[PDB]
Amino acid sequence: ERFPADFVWGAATAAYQIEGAVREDGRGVSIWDTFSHTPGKIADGTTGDVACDSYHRYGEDIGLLNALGMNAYRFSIAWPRIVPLGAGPINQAGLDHYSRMVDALLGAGLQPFVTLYHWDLPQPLEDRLGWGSRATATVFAEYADIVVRQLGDRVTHWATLNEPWCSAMLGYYLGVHAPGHTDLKRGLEASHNLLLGHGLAVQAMRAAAPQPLQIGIVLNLTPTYPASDSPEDVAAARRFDGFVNRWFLDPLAGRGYPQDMLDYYGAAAPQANPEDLTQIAAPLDWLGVNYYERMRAVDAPDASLPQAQRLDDPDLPHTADREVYPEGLYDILLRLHNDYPFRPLYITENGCALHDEIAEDGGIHDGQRQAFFEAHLAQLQRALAAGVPLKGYFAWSLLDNFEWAMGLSMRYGICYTNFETLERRIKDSGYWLRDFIAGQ
Numbered sequence: 464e465r466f467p468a469d470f471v472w473g474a475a476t477a478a479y480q481i482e483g484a485v486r487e488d489g490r491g492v493s494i495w496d497t498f499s500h501t502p503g504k505i506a507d508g509t510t511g512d513v514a515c516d517s518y519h520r521y522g523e524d525i526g527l528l529n530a531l532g533m534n535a536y537r538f539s540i541a542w543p544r545i546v547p548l549g550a551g552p553i554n555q556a557g558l559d560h561y562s563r564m565v566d567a568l569l570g571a572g573l574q575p576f577v578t579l580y581h582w583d584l585p586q587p588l589e590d591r592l593g594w595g596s597r598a599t600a601t602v603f604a605e606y607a608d609i610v611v612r613q614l615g616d617r618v619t620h621w622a623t624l625n626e627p628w629c630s631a632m633l634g635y636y637l638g639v640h641a642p643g644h645t646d647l648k649r650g651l652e653a654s655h656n657l658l659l660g661h662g663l664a665v666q667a668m669r670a671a672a673p674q675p676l677q678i679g680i681v682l683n684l685t686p687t688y689p690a691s692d693s694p695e696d697v698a699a700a701r702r703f704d705g706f707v708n709r710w711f712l713d714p715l716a717g718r719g720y721p722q723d724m725l726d727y728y729g730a731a732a733p734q735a736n737p738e739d740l741t742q743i744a745a746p747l748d749w750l751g752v753n754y755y756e757r758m759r760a761v762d763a764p765d766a767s768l769p770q771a772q773r774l775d776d777p778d779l780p781h782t783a784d785r786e787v788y789p790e791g792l793y794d795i796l797l798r799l800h801n802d803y804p805f806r807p808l809y810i811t812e813n814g815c816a817l818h819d820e821i822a823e824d825g826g827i828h829d830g831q832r833q834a835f836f837e838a839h840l841a842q843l844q845r846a847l848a849a850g851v852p853l854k855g856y857f858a859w860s861l862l863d864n865f866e867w868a869m870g871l872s873m874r875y876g877i878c879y880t881n882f883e884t885l886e887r888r889i890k891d892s893g894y895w896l897r898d899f900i901a902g903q
């Protein structure tokens with residue numbers, strides 16, 4: 464029934480999804496500025512130019528966090544505000560902005576959990592191949608050093624990357640996210656340079672920090688289940704598990720890349736010399752899990768890689784964009800606890816999108832989202848009872864925002880954002896979380 468007294472309770476955002484102010488105070492161009500301004504890439508014709516205007520309205524965001532009784536806020540720093548050319552001089556005005564924001568959070572009793580990279584690569588670096596180039600890993604580590612030197616007196620909890628599988632595979636192989644390339648080899652090379660950037664940044668951050676830091680990385684993990692026990696379906700489930708989960712977990716754990724996936728990828732696999740793998744496995748203080756969905760896999764040999772397709776279950780609840788499977792959160796946490804070395808663990812994102820509207824009474828009656836949270840929180844209690852060292856939970860998202868290729872049309876907030884007036888309003892699920900946390 465009861466969570467630990469010192470459990471972290473938060474909500475999460477990312478800079479490009481909320482900030483707006485894309486040209487203000489020296490900000491450079493990111494790959495997502497380029498991509499969202501390319502005709503046809505965003506489903507509803509919107510961009511992040513304004514978004515939630517949180518660059519100016521972060522005080523309102525803090526008011527919401529306080530109204531919800533949270534004790535932490537997960538947000539990202541925009542690399543284009545700090546080093547507008549990607550590699551080059553710093554923009555002190557960008558650092559000063561986040562320094563003021565951090566002081567405002569600490570003044571309100573909210574612990575900042577900062578993500579350094581949440582997908583907004585400076586465009587000048589993409590012009591030089593972006594994550595397809597090892598040089599980008601080096602300059603990412605330089606950016607991490609700069610930020611820690613100025614904010615690390617107040618921020619202890621840092622993550623290097625958010626969801627490298629998305630940046631690599633959606634951005635460079637499937638072409639649905641920025642920068643929008645469609646080449647498997649480039650996607651796998653990007654996955655390696657992301658991991659190398661992470662490892663180089665961890666070392667740089669520890670050397671630059673004015674106090675001991677707690678450094679992690681944030682991964683999306685998808686528990687995978689075969690649709691049947693046939694050799695074909697079990698193999699498809701292992702391939703999908705390797706493609707999303709083990710490709711990242713194993714090198715971070717010091718186990719190299721998974722051999723079964725190297726064999727499957729063949730000539731497309733990156734050249735991973737052992738020096739790189741040692742750097743990638745730099746010791747971490749925590750691991751962040753982003754959990755949304757499971758994969759029930761059936762073999763699909765004529766499909767594209769990894770030749771596994773999803774078998775939908777019409778009996779389970781569905782949101783605006785996903786299938787709901789709360790028990791997968793327990794499963795993946797138990798797997799991490801038993802099979803991998805990372806601890807403690809945080810749930811750095813969990814949430815859902817619905818077709819929310821303001822009702823006649825002025826509230827947002829998002830009962831499915833309340834049920835979503837209740838069901839996932841129950842699974843966390845089960846995981847804690849099994850001994851999983853879980854230390855906090857962050858709802859995605861604090862407020863409705865720019866949901867990447869879906870634009871403003873996919874609402875994940877616990878607070879509703881009116882994108883015309885920029886007013887925020889707490890949804891019923893947000894009041895449920897407030898009252899649940901208060902009872903803890």
Ligand SMILES: OC[C@H]1O[C@@H](O)[C@H](O)[C@@H](O)[C@@H]1O
Pocket residue numbers: 477625626629683753812859866875
């Ligand atoms: O699609 C919902 C969320 O998915 C997570 O993978 C990303 O970190 C968020 O930025 C995104 O909004």
